[PDB]
Paper text:
The non-receptor protein tyrosine phosphatase SHP2, encoded by the PTPN11 proto-oncogene, is required for normal development and functions downstream of growth factor, cytokine, and adhesion receptors. SHP2 contains two tandem SH2 domains (N-SH2 and C-SH2), a catalytic protein tyrosine phosphatase (PTP) domain, and a C-terminal tail that has at least two phosphorylation sites. Normally, the binding of tyrosine-phosphorylated ligands to the SHP2 tandem SH2 domains is required to overcome autoinhibition, but oncogenic mutations of SHP2 destabilize the autoinhibited conformation and lead to enhanced basal activity in the absence of tyrosine-phosphorylated ligand stimulation. Allosteric modulators that stabilize the closed form of SHP2 have been recently reported. This class of allosteric inhibitors was designed to stabilize the autoinhibited state of the enzyme by acting as a molecular glue between the N-SH2 domain and the catalytic domain.
To investigate how the most frequently observed SHP2 oncogenic mutation, E76K, affects the structure of SHP2, we resolved the X-ray structure of near full-length SHP2E76K (1–525) to 2.6 Å. We found that, in comparison with the basal conformation of SHP2WT, the C-SH2 domain of SHP2E76K undergoes a 120-degree rotation with respect to the adjacent PTP domain, which fully exposes the PTP active site and repositions the N-SH2 domain onto a PTP domain surface opposite the catalytic pocket. The swiveling of the C-SH2 domain thus acts as a pivot to move the N-SH2 domain across the entire body of the PTP domain from one side to the other in switching from closed to open conformations. In both the basal SHP2WT and open SHP2E76K structures, the phosphotyrosyl binding site of each SH2 domain remains accessible to solvent. Nevertheless, there are interdomain contacts between the N-SH2 domain and the PTP domain that create a remarkably different N-SH2•PTP interdomain interaction surface in SHP2E76K from the N-SH2•PTP interface observed in the autoinhibited conformation of SHP2WT. The buried surface area of the N-SH2 domain decreases from 1025 Å2 in SHP2WT to 357 Å in E76K, with no overlapping contact residues. Specific interactions include a salt-bridge between R4 of the N-SH2 domain and D485 of the PTP domain, and hydrophobic contacts between T73 and V484. Key residues that stabilize the position of the C-SH2 domain with respect to the PTP domain in the open-state structure of E76K lie in the segment preceding the C-SH2 domain core, and in the linker between the C-SH2 domain and the PTP domain. The open state of SHP2E76K involves a 120-degree pivot of the C-SH2 domain, relocalization of the N-SH2 domain to an alternative PTP domain interaction surface, and full exposure of the phosphatase active site. Likewise, the X-ray structure of SHP2E76K fits the SHP2E76K SAXS envelope particularly well (NSD 0.99, Chi 0.77).
Numbering used by the authors: 0 to 89, 93 to 139, 146 to 153, 166 to 174, 178 to 202, 210 to 236, 245 to 312, 325 to 525
Amino acid sequence: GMTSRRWFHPNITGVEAENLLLTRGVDGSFLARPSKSNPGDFTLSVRRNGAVTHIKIQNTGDYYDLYGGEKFATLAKLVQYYMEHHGQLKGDVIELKYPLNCADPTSERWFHGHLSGKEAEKLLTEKGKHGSFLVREDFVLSVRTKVTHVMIRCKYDVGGGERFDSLTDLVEHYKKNPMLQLKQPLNTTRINAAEIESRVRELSKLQGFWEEFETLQQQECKLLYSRKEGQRQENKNKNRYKNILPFDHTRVVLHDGDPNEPVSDYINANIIMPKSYIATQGCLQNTVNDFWRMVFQENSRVIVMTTKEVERGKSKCVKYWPDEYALKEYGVMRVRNVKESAAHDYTLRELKLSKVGQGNTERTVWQYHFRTWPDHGVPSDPGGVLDFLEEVHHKQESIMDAGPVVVHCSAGIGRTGTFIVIDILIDIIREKGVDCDIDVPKTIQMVRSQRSGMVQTEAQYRFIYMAVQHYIETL
């Protein structure tokens, strides 16, 4: 009974609130709405013994109060507390029993929110077809056959005829008896952080997640950038798969290599910029020296390993780090394993990297080896991955001038993309909280333009949503 603001009515008045509660509601019903008493503050309208009371909710920027009593980080938390505790007093007691859900479009797939008539016509032509429709903010029920914008007055009707209780009912009733014929919706992928729980329910019902991923897969044609360095005879033995190559414009360029070697400037790795990252593949025996040259050169102090060296009988990454207490040389680079510490889902190895011939070059590189990801599929609970990502974030924040975080699996696209995309999104939520707009496929596309095919499966696609929703819940 958390996260969602369904009982929140953003555009109603005190008189409308009383009317809704007295007609549509019952004793113990309630809704929240913005305060007319103070901008930014909220007012809670509740039905008690046949009449409606209005309670002031203080919003200080740091917390939410009822001008005294317990404090909460979000409005939904304040509401859940009072719904489950019943310590809402004046000295009269008020009970928060049944939320009165807002009938206006909110977290709806077909609802594009704030979007101009020209912007909707630009969207219904570039990505839309015949019968295709979108609802924008009164409400414009824009259709396409050329785009015809059917207006709607708020009871809700499209000029005349039938008055439906909610727009979710009026969008399904105008598709059966066409006024213009409605066939399929344009659909949005943007979702407000606080409403992810609702959207995840929509995408789970018969399929939303499949639709979203397939659509995203269809847009890879627009990301057919040059991979010329990756596709060369001199670099053919440096790639795990001949089809998974770095883009030339984003690739990590290596310097001062072995002159005997034909090409020394190459590694299957790309810089990812939303704090930057290096999405790289698992080490091949022949690329171990290159990986460390790159770690040194880029000033990275954190490595995120998301694969076991051996998974389902196959070599996914070669062991590129020395054993506990030991030291090893990897070409020009020396690595010393100082300490290995273990947690439930991962192991942290504290490594000391330096150029051979100079101790004045030594820096600590922290390797966060995630060991519990399944051979095939995604983890049941996103908690572990989130606790891991929080550990990696604090380490990166705690270090001065630390370079990009090197993230890798085998190919450097599947789990690498999943980890980087989850980290990018939860960072938007860290800086803006529950009141921010997040677009999972817009973010994936943005990362895909930097390294090809980041986030390989639909399982992974759903897992990003599952981790981001779970992150929101804990706030």
